[PDB]
């Protein structure tokens, strides 16, 4: 006990402490190592069971197949309902296979008088497992050489294509041993595949007769939702919609002192007007929000709200519940700090003084919005709050409603960043922005999965906080380039408003902060004119999102594969879908300014073709079709197209094993 | 629950199912990831406990240090007694460090008055934890930071190295969190470091007046033990000493039919004379064995017996207990087979018919020899017997006597080979023989550990069954080369008798079987003449083992590191000892025939030196000394020396950190 060894099971996360991640309709590949004594054959069955919903802290049997690696068995299952699933690998020794294969070897050299009876004692014993109806042809197979005679006489009834297939249906299993049980938590598909748009509701004001921005409202914001849907975004992410503190409120450009009219950063949550459960009054009544949400839902979109666990001084909690802060000896509370950033306008919470006190309130707050149709939260700076809290908050929320999803904006070293994902965060921001070399992007891409069992990255081209240097000086071409990279590399990607307008001016050289940042200032934008003057990337983005919807390969984490292109400025990779066999290849240039050309060397095995093969491809932007082979010429001219997104011949029905591991 | 995150702990094997491996006086490096909220400091303590001498199914505290990888903490402990040890990592937040480090920054920019009081309640509260009269210079500091004044005035004793070292012995810990507990099974040092010599007792006969071999006896064999000890071997491994079956006994050169005088293979255990518990009568009474063991013991050596769970037909078990076999329909028992090898002289056992029946008998047998001083067994073909048996047998034996060690001769694909090691085998044979190119050996060497936490390889230059082709035609030079490789790469190595005589003739071209194999035939050898005629590698081997004893670096699994040599035929690697700092470099040629030269590029960081450094080395065979630097000229002439074994400057007391991971 264990009679048959089962080891190195995957996917298991942190040795089973945390469930693995998957979504509905995703092919989940499972593998394990099973072995036993000698050359005696062994087989494994992947046992999948679907439990209820519920959240952590009749069976379905799938046969597994051996492969290249000795003793390593592979399997798959596709979850069809949201919730918690279980799998384990059962190992057994299948005597029939041993006997059959051994006899065929002996059959070639023509006596054997012994083995045949042994077979003959197998199939009837096998017969006990099969129902009297179809039970019978084995006994037919079982009684055609117990009667003496030639060897080839009854090999008929053994090598018959009819009895492996029934035995496949009902197998004769010996020494059955069960492996450990591990769990997968399946979420709705939006957890993996969807595109994000970050907009500031207040910036939808649109100026007055004097050229001065006007504070917008949920009503006006909702007016902008169609153009957004038009670009193909599935989720709209809103900076906090709560009242902005009036004390120590910051002025334009992170200025310490606020003018009387300045608006302050939405992240300075709380004022005498309200807390985390109240809409900032300038935006509108809470019904207005309900109306905005409903508007989005009409267009096929979802709303994601910023969850920032911090307080401005006027926040009711500063008075009503003050245990929740770390108060200095002179009674003041130290302003929030994240090195080297300073947040003079807010207070960090203290989760240790009154844990079940604060815990319950924050749960209360999150639940408020769940009741208003918000089932995706962009958790803000999760790494500066206790891990166990998040683990608690997530499980606590998801158990009442399991369709609630969390995105963790944790720009922090790996152990924390990936660590946080493990606790349950459905998606995580990534280090993506700071990957810009062919080698960096290659590595960033491959790691994507790799870590798929527990991290889903959301690739944002920019955020209000991050205006990468490369975007600053390379002109509109680069904006395309990052967009192509983001959209193709990950199932989930995002964009901060104005990106499509090529906003590229930073506050000072060497900074990553947007000049005249929207956080501190109202920023109406006039998208329409840009469209008219052909200085908008809105069309391109639309075409990018359409492509994603069109090809299911782009909803996959696991299958990215990089092909060699002998140019340091050109990067070429491919994705495929295990289900439909869909297959797509992307080639992009990382230099926005000069045409760059090269020879692209496909790894045909990876694409499901032999090396010598020749095949036809289609360019999804152009529609042009051409014939390609293992080595192909490619030349990319920015200012014509910064990328070729190529539809490739569908991966044959060997899809499932090109997914192995 | 889980306030401070502790994850990715190592060493853990198969997620804790199996204990890790270590020996007495071995430095075991432990690492884990610990993190918490924000920039609040965190610390970890490695907690070691020594339990018993019992075997698987007051605390010692070691502080752990951060390092290169954020949030990753490293530690080490050195077991001083045989038995089962436990370790876990405890994580805590140390507020003092947060406070101190923050203050130094503030101290430079010169009121700030708030923080000082905060410190004051820390050291006081810190002091309460040290309720000893050695406390507290802290109130000296604790009442040296409260009264009004300048900051540097009241920094008094805080920055000065007087209260941290005190805090070091007694620390102020917050949010202490317990990590999971994992176990290490510590064995006697021979488990890792010792050299093996394989000899056939029967071959010590020495001819008669006609030039005909004479069967030897334990008495005569014991006569050869000094010479063996003289070469520096710590263990003598004996093919089975039991009676050889008389039916289907195999003849010289594996011929199927045995002449009346032929001896047969010792692995055909059992005859009407006796079973596994009896000495083959031709060797002598069991007292003779006891005498042989004692002879070895006198010379500093150990005896290891072959444990082969198989039977010849005349074996008493064939009648007395026949449930133990797989009996055919016609009542015969199929002869043992291991593809493609055929073992016509033996019967495989059947472990499923009467498990606790057979289990108990084999335990009985193993136990017999343990009582006769044999505490190392060379388990034979373990992969052809059930895993659970071995797991049981090992745990069952070791619990009565924990100094009993097992070596698994499992030449099988990885999942099995390493799997077998994991469930308890103290050492394992390896694929070593078939690694012969610079890149193959490099990969093989690095893997050694890697897998050290659960596999200890025993590197055999040859075995009675394996006479590698490379030895067949490259002449005495190669025998040196493999010996250098085996002896240096692994703490444990071995050689089969006659290797030192350059026995290089195989039965047919393309085979790995020794011509006129000792298994089937008596082979007395005359070592003395070879010594006299200078055609023996006995001197070299002696010098190799002395070197191993001399430098503790060579008893390490973990520390091998490969340095670049720009010649495909030259391989250069180094080992060091974390304890003493000993450091050694080996450079060998893989080409036995032509002089080969190159530039050797040391990774000085790995050797504990800066790149620009210049240092002195000594050649352990030659005694010559010279000055070297980062890049050095090296030229190797076989037929002079196939290797340079170089003593290098001792790794500084940064030994612990170059062992990290
Ligand atoms: O008002 C508080 C804080 O707001 C902004 O910082 C935000 C940041 O923009 C968000 O992306 C979030 O992830 O982090 C901070 C809030 O947690 C301003 O940049 C900052 O100056 C201000 O103090
Ligand atoms: O006597 C049975 C069998 O003995 C030998 O095979 C051995 C082998 O030499 C040992 O090294 C061991 O590891 O495996 C076998 C026993 O399990 C002969 O090689 C073989 O011909 C003979 O049948």
Author numbering:
A (entry chain A), B (entry chain B): 15 to 71, 92 to 144, 149 to 699
Manuscript text:
GlgE is an α-maltose-1-phosphate:(1 → 4)-α-D-glucan-4-α-D-maltosyltransferase that catalyzes the addition of maltose to maltooligosaccharides. One such example is GlgE, which has been genetically validated as an anti-tubercular target. Deletion of the glgE gene in M. tb results in the rapid killing of the bacterium due to the toxic effects of M1P accumulation. Overall, the Mtb GlgE structure is very similar to the previously reported Sco GlgEI enzyme with both enzymes sharing the same 5-domain architecture.
